[PDB]
Paper text:
The cryo-EM structures were determined for both ancestral and Beta spike trimers after incubation at 37 °C. Single particle ab-initio 3D-classification identified one main canonical 3D-class or map for the trimeric protein that corresponds to a single canonical conformation. The ancestral spike trimer map represents the prefusion conformation where two RBDs are in a down conformation, while the third one is facing upward in the up conformation. This quaternary structure is referred to as the one_RBD up conformation and was refined to 2.85 Å. The overall architecture of the trimeric antigen is similar to structures reported previously. The minimal resolution for ancestral trimer is observed for both-down oriented RBDs. The up-oriented RBDs are only visible when reducing the electron density threshold and no density is observed for the distal part. The 2xPro mutation was clearly visible in both the ancestral and Beta trimer models, while the other modifications fall within regions that are not resolved. Our structural work showed a canonical form for the ancestral trimer that is characterized by one RBD in the up conformation. These findings coincide with the structure described by Wrapp et al.. Ancestral spike trimers transition at a slower rate taking three days to shift meaningfully to the canonical conformation with only ~ 80% canonical conformation after the 5-day time point.
Severe acute respiratory syndrome coronavirus 2 (SARS-CoV-2), responsible for the COVID-19 pandemic, uses a surface expressed trimeric spike glycoprotein for cell entry. This trimer is the primary target for neutralizing antibodies making it a key candidate for vaccine development. To stabilize both proteins in the prefusion conformation two proline substitutions of residues 986 and 987 were performed. The region encoding for the transmembrane helix and cytosolic tail were replaced by a 27 amino acid C-terminal T4 bacteriophage fibritin foldon domain to ensure protein trimerization.
Author numbering:
A (entry chain B): 27 to 66, 81 to 131, 164 to 172, 187 to 196, 200 to 211, 215 to 242, 263 to 331, 529 to 676, ...
B (entry chain A): 941 to 1139
C (entry chain A): 295 to 442, 452 to 470, 503 to 676, 690 to 741
D (entry chain C): 854 to 890
E (entry chain C): 941 to 990
Amino acid sequence: AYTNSFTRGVYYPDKVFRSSVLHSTQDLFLPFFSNVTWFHNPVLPFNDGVYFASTEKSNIIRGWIFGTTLDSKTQSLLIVNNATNVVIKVCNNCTFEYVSKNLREFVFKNYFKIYSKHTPINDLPQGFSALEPLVDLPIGINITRFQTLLAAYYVGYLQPRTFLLKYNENGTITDAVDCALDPLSETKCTLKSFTVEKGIYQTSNFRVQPTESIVRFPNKSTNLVKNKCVNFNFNGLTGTGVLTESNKKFLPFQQFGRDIADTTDAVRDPQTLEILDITPCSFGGVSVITPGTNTSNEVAVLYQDVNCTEVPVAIHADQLTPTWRVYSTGSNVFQTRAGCLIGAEHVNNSYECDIPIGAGICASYQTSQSIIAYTMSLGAENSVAYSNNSIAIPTNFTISVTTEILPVSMTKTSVDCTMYICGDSTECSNLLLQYGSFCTQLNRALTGIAVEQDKNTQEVFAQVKQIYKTPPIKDFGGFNFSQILPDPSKSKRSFIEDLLFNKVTKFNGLTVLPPLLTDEMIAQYTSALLAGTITSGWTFGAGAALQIPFAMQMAYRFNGIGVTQNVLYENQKLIANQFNSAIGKIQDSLSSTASALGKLQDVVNQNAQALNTLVKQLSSNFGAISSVLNDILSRLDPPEAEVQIDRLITGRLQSLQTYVTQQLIRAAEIRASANLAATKMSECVLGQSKRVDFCGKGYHLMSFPQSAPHGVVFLHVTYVPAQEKNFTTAPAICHDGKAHFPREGVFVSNGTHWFVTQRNFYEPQIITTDNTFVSGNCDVVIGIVNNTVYD
Amino acid sequence: TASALGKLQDVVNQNAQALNTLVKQLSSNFGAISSVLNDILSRLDPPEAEVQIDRLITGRLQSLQTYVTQQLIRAAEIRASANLAATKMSECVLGQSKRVDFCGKGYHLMSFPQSAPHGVVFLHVTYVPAQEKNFTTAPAICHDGKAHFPREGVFVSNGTHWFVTQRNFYEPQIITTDNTFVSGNCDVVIGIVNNTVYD
Amino acid sequence: PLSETKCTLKSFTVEKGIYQTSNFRVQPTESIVRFPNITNLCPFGEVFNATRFASVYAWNRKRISNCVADYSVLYNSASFSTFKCYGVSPTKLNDLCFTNVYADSFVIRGDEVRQIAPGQTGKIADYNYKLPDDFTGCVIAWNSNNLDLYRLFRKSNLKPFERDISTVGYQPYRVVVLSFELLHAPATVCGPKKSTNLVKNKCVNFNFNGLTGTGVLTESNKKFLPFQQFGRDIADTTDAVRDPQTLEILDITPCSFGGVSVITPGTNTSNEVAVLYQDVNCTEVPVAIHADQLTPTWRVYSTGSNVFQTRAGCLIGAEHVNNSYECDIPIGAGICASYQTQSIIAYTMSLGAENSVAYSNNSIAIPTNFTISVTTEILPVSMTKTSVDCTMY
Amino acid sequence: KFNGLTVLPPLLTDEMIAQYTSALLAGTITSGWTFGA
Amino acid sequence: TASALGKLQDVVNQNAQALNTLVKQLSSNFGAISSVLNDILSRLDPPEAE
Ligand SMILES: *[C@@H]1O[C@H](CO)[C@@H](O)[C@H](O)[C@H]1NC(C)=O
Ligand SMILES: *[C@@H]1O[C@H](CO)[C@@H](O)[C@H](O)[C@H]1NC(C)=O
Ligand SMILES: *[C@@H]1O[C@H](CO)[C@@H](O)[C@H](O)[C@H]1NC(C)=O
Ligand SMILES: *[C@@H]1O[C@H](CO)[C@@H](O)[C@H](O)[C@H]1NC(C)=O
Ligand SMILES: *[C@@H]1O[C@H](CO)[C@@H](O)[C@H](O)[C@H]1NC(C)=O
Ligand SMILES: *[C@@H]1O[C@H](CO)[C@@H](O)[C@H](O)[C@H]1NC(C)=O
Ligand SMILES: *[C@@H]1O[C@H](CO)[C@@H](O)[C@H](O)[C@H]1NC(C)=O
Ligand SMILES: *[C@@H]1O[C@H](CO)[C@@H](O)[C@H](O)[C@H]1NC(C)=O
Ligand SMILES: *[C@@H]1O[C@H](CO)[C@@H](O)[C@H](O)[C@H]1NC(C)=O
Ligand SMILES: *[C@@H]1O[C@H](CO)[C@@H](O)[C@H](O)[C@H]1NC(C)=O
Ligand SMILES: *[C@@H]1O[C@H](CO)[C@@H](O)[C@H](O)[C@H]1NC(C)=O
Ligand SMILES: *[C@@H]1O[C@H](CO)[C@@H](O)[C@H](O)[C@H]1NC(C)=O
Ligand SMILES: *[C@@H]1O[C@H](CO)[C@@H](O)[C@H](O)[C@H]1NC(C)=O
Ligand SMILES: *[C@@H]1O[C@H](CO)[C@@H](O)[C@H](O)[C@H]1NC(C)=O
Ligand SMILES: *[C@@H]1O[C@H](CO)[C@@H](O)[C@H](O)[C@H]1NC(C)=O
Ligand SMILES: *[C@@H]1O[C@H](CO)[C@@H](O)[C@H](O)[C@H]1NC(C)=O
Ligand SMILES: *[C@@H]1O[C@H](CO)[C@@H](O)[C@H](O)[C@H]1NC(C)=O
Ligand SMILES: *[C@@H]1O[C@H](CO)[C@@H](O)[C@H](O)[C@H]1NC(C)=O
Ligand SMILES: *[C@@H]1O[C@H](CO)[C@@H](O)[C@H](O)[C@H]1NC(C)=O
């Protein structure tokens, strides 16, 4: 009888307290969802370590016996528990002695370590319970078999498997992940987290192992094997690859062929005058494609650059868990240009890309729900009804507000060079003094980056000479502006600014310098810019601020984009309502989703990852006897302590140099982004921009700035036509033998009558010498149309 | 003012300091018994001179790599600055720019180039209003039940009379059909006022 | 501080600004050694003075724990021909504390004496007795010709620390190897080091079972399990330690440190400076700046009436001013410093003159005049074409 | 690919890039800047 | 003509040259007595092979 072990049998790997930390350890652990034999007397082998489970209340089981032969000729160990006493012996010829409804778990491993746990239960239960160490017997005995002294118990065997342990605030293990259970758990272990976001993650490395070794010597030699990755040995040079027939013709005195980069590609075998190619056997990456962890646990596996029929072989599929073997076969394979994709159903339909794979292939979690792989769709097919006498003219419009987010600055991290490399060590400092001024160079570069961050922030935000305030009367012609104007009733930031700020959320020589401008000052600058823009248009940026009603400012903007002011003057209420609705939609989207500020989240995550890597680089030996400078100094003499300290110094100096170089490149990127943001605030906010798609999609009317953690957000108010109608158009109108052309507009016809209308809004007008101008005769213009012109 | 050209002097100082650090890096032992190849070779046999020379080679190669990486980053920054300068020469100098604050504060009239050590200097001539006056304004004018809007400018009032003026300079004009156009009626415009339009 | 700034800048003239000159550090005040109170003398007599030693192919092994070893007698004894230690220095045995000791004793020939070392091969060093490449211990060899079997061969080379039993320079030399266990475990075999008292809330140099360090020891409320001896943080660094003599958990906080910046105007203007101690309270500034070991001029910038606590650190030597002006020398968190009536003043930077535009729905401001302004813009274009001959360099 | 070197294919194929450019050309020819606005 | 599209060809050449240099760097001894890992392992002892 076999029973599923669920996820039980996890003990404490070491005696080190940990709290609120995810720690990955490598030791002998019971595999998750394994099979344990159920005995309902028998002698069983020990292997590496034994997990014992008992479900009893009457305490039938009393002890254990361990050994090899269990009858003389060796030492056998024995444990017996009676009443409130426990006796352990290695018996005579005794060399050791020790005296010290219910589910009891025990773990025995070889020094003999015994971990124990006791729980109440009401059929192995489903749950988690860590095992605290209880017994450590200094025996040094070889055990390969054991038996139980007494009616039902479970026996399982431990294996060398890596686990990711989760510690709570009180130091008790709550959850764990078996890194070799399935691709999802491997992804969790690689990400060092229990939650995985949607996407593709490169987790593993796949390589074909050699199957046999062949040696060929000229007249101890073996027979050559073709079409198999083998460990060959021709003459004097060794290698691993696949030997196949080749059409190359070597010269009689030549034995090997080299590629352009000094790489051997063909070899002539010594026994026979034959040339064999050498191709490396398959290798590549193994990536896991998953949706959100809380969405589904289904995953797909992609093996880059491998034939899809050789995936099961050379991946040790037979040596992996049965859970992983699902992702090697199953008639659900798909050979793409990137590689063989297993676990995703191929769909002939095309949708928008969700998770890219390569060569136009995308995967998604769509309909039962399963992973589907398809070819990405470039968009909706369209065909413009083009003709030489038809024009489409809009009759309505929509006011749309879009959002753009740009990073501006970073966190000013300052790394104490000497404290990081040789912290609290005079000998280490003296040894480091021989390396010149690398340390001063690193400090200077970091200081330059820190100053550049403040320069970026000042350039982006400090663009207004004075501080402007909105009047107490907010009669702005129907426009609300209350969502973006500052709220003094509470850090006097606006509602949207608060949403943005809430959306995004010191030792070994590492420090963080505060920015020169505080969030309150940045909010003050943004409020001044908003007040100036609302009250004076672009006059505040051109010079002294000149007040103007907001309706007249919007009329200015429409005239600038090419629409007459009357459109605003008798569509004012509709335009104001559309603007208010757009602002409300922006607020709702910001309050709902959290991926809008991913541009700033990426910068924060990159900086945090770099800092964490720098911190973790201090635990490496770099070839030394230990990674602790104090331990090296207290253990070794100066003649050898110097060598160990030199190794550590070289490693840590290399780590610091790498960190500084990466920080410099990232700072260059952030400075470019800050320059772009400064230009956008100068052009979109302080004026009206005619550049296409610079200040959002559509005809840009205006823009509003907001401050976000280490960045600026632009709300781009634009004009977009909505409904269009067909009309018949003519390049010119012939009235009295002279061609007529419109001053500003197009000629259109509803079927019987001809009018002149503006480009971006349908407004027919009587053709008149005030609307048109005369130029030339009617015999030159192609497509002229006879009509009359009013006078 | 001596510190007017600090942008170019910063580049000069950075390059000079990098070169000075690279030169001073030759005085470091890097773990060897001495920083002089000639002294090492004259004092020691090839078996140990090899170790000393290897230490010196490693140190000096690391110094060169650091210097070259810093120089590459600085060169990329200078290339970005040169591209910006070329764009400014094309737009501000060879034409009139409508971009705000691209060619100086104010309404950019024109610009002049001058040379400087490893740099270019732009003298931006711009227009800036100086003195401003208050006026009463209306969105449109009612004359005969029809709304009149200015062709180019705004309506202003000195207290009793209504004129039409351009945006950036006060120049009152008689409100006529030459500078006003008719569109719509008087019942829809918000804030319309009553006046006369001369024919 | 001004002369220190000059020394760091390698110049006799210092431009106006704030410069990073030196570093802040609190020196330890007390030395703490805490060892278990074990009076059991470690029994090395049964290992060293034993009359009968087993053969080389059946080398005798003994395990030592729960004792206070004294290697000074063995080191000072002249009865040992050679005493070679590899992972630990001979003189640091008296100070270091181990967990377990393995004593392996046998008898070999003088030629094979040199073969008892890591990374060695031979008749005995490869087919009879092996040592790990990272062996940590000491080998003691001495002749016994005046005081008082080799294996031929086998199938292959036995793995280190494995014993298999199946089926002039010629004088006998007794060889005893003491291998120390350095695994992650509570220390058990210590040396004869006298323990001291325990002091808290002080920057001290502690020593818990050989775990050297420096920091401030404070009582913590961590829920340590009975088998847990110490704790680690997110960065895998020691955070709490259990007292070897008392079931008490002590939190370790490293002694205070930070940066020291000097804010000065031009030397042509004034010789007065201000000092900023980054990320530290103003209470610990004088006690750790070594003022009573520094020059009398350095004592001025350690205390005084002009002490300002800012978000960027503690500012000493600058007078706080309620008014706000344009920034002159930045400090952090909106704080700026300047040289004005003169002395160094610290204030909050001003963002500009306040203004309110007289907005209304029927009023417009129109210019009547204008001005023509010419402004200067400077952009770098190129650098110096420097080529360095790497081979000749 | 001999010593751990791999070349990942681009997500967008040459045919897809050509389709983008053809759509842009068709929109420009038959509509002007209205398709972009 | 032939030099019209040199901008893209320069990028291709730079990438190819960088890859070629990276692969070619595997033939250098870097101070060791041999550049072949298998030869070093089969010819030296672990104390020096390390
Ligand atoms: C492992 O256990 C499961 C569940 O009890 C069972 O279905 C399966 O047959 C077992 N495996 C073997 C090899 O018996
Ligand atoms: C324990 O003894 C068995 C029986 O010969 C043997 O096969 C095994 O290798 C031994 N294990 C150890 C660690 O000595
Ligand atoms: C942790 O300890 C605290 C004691 O303050 C207790 O309230 C809490 O329930 C404990 N949590 C767990 C998971 O044991
Ligand atoms: C080597 O010996 C084999 C024996 O069968 C023979 O076939 C082959 O031709 C020989 N090659 C040379 C080069 O002598
Ligand atoms: C996402 O997954 C985490 C992990 O359990 C869960 O706590 C969270 O509620 C999930 N999100 C949603 C919206 O359900
Ligand atoms: C992969 O293996 C199949 C085996 O049927 C073979 O036909 C094919 O040529 C191989 N290569 C590719 C790229 O499919
Ligand atoms: C999917 O499309 C391919 C064309 O490449 C076709 O051969 C196949 O029959 C289609 N499958 C289905 C289920 O329609
Ligand atoms: C334009 O659309 C709005 C709604 O978006 C609608 O209320 C209005 O009536 C439309 N105008 C015309 C002329 O159709
Ligand atoms: C603006 O919108 C708010 C709701 O967001 C509303 O309470 C208010 O009355 C509106 N008008 C003004 C002038 O604030
Ligand atoms: C204009 O006419 C074409 C063809 O008659 C038609 O496809 C198109 O939809 C029409 N436009 C509108 C706005 O209806
Ligand atoms: C448009 O083209 C058609 C031919 O397709 C031609 O008959 C007609 O005259 C043309 N009209 C104009 C206005 O060019
Ligand atoms: C316009 O009138 C307001 C109302 O007090 C005043 O504040 C402002 O200074 C006036 N404008 C000018 C240019 O004087
Ligand atoms: C301006 O607002 C006032 C309300 O205080 C109103 O009476 C007046 O008609 C408005 N004038 C214009 C031109 O909007
Ligand atoms: C006995 O052991 C002691 C160490 O305490 C040593 O000094 C002495 O030489 C030993 N006796 C002999 C005969 O070696
Ligand atoms: C000796 O150490 C024990 C802990 O092992 C402690 O309880 C006891 O108080 C100590 N006694 C003295 C005198 O130090
Ligand atoms: C200091 O400044 C004054 C002008 O205020 C100048 O005359 C003098 O030469 C300067 N000192 C030096 C050493 O240059
Ligand atoms: C000063 O000490 C207090 C507690 O006494 C604590 O906030 C922190 O350690 C220090 N504060 C600052 C701002 O450095
Ligand atoms: C002036 O400074 C003192 C000293 O901190 C402070 O208590 C007081 O509130 C300040 N006065 C004003 C008006 O800020
Ligand atoms: C305009 O300003 C200039 C000086 O810049 C002055 O000479 C001129 O009289 C002013 N004109 C008016 C109308 O105020």
